[PDB]
Amino acid sequence: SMNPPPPETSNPNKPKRQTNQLQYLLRVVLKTLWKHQFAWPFQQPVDAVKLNLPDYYKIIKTPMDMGTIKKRLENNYYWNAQECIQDFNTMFTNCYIYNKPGDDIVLMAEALEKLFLQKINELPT
Ligand SMILES: Cn1cc(-c2ccc(C(=O)Nc3cc(-c4ccccc4)ccc3N)cc2)c2cc[nH]c2c1=O
Secondary structure, eight states: OOSOOOOOOOOTTSOOOOOHHHHHIIIIIIHHHHTSTTOGGGSSOOOTTTTTOTTHHHHOSSOOOHHHHHHHHHTTOOSSHHHHHHHHHHHHHHHHHHSOTTOHHHHHHHHHHHHHHHHHTTOOO
């Protein structure tokens, strides 16, 4: 179909291990953004069919969304905090390169990104 399969969220042969930073990314970063009033465009993969964005997956080579990130954190998919930070960055990049700068969706992403950056600047060592 027009939409790809969603990104993988389970890492079956990776050992499960906590880190301080991954705890922070789930319990502080993801939780804060997930509950934000503007989270809803970002809580699941973009549905190009329902949104009538037939070129979305032409332009966006690496789909990413917070529902995927949440599942990855809850499944201990990431080997390190930087992979998770990269996924957040990719999500925001996708929004900014696809949508018009004045789109309400872009303005919502910018508010979430500011909060993301504020929390990441306090990432523990
Ligand atoms: C990342 N992203 C997401 C969306 C998007 C937009 C809308 C939705 C969505 O769930 N839309 C929706 C909102 C309400 C709603 C929200 C607030 C108040 C009232 C009603 C209801 C139903 C639906 N389907 C998802 C996703 C999008 C649209 C154009 N470009 C992008 C983009 O880059």
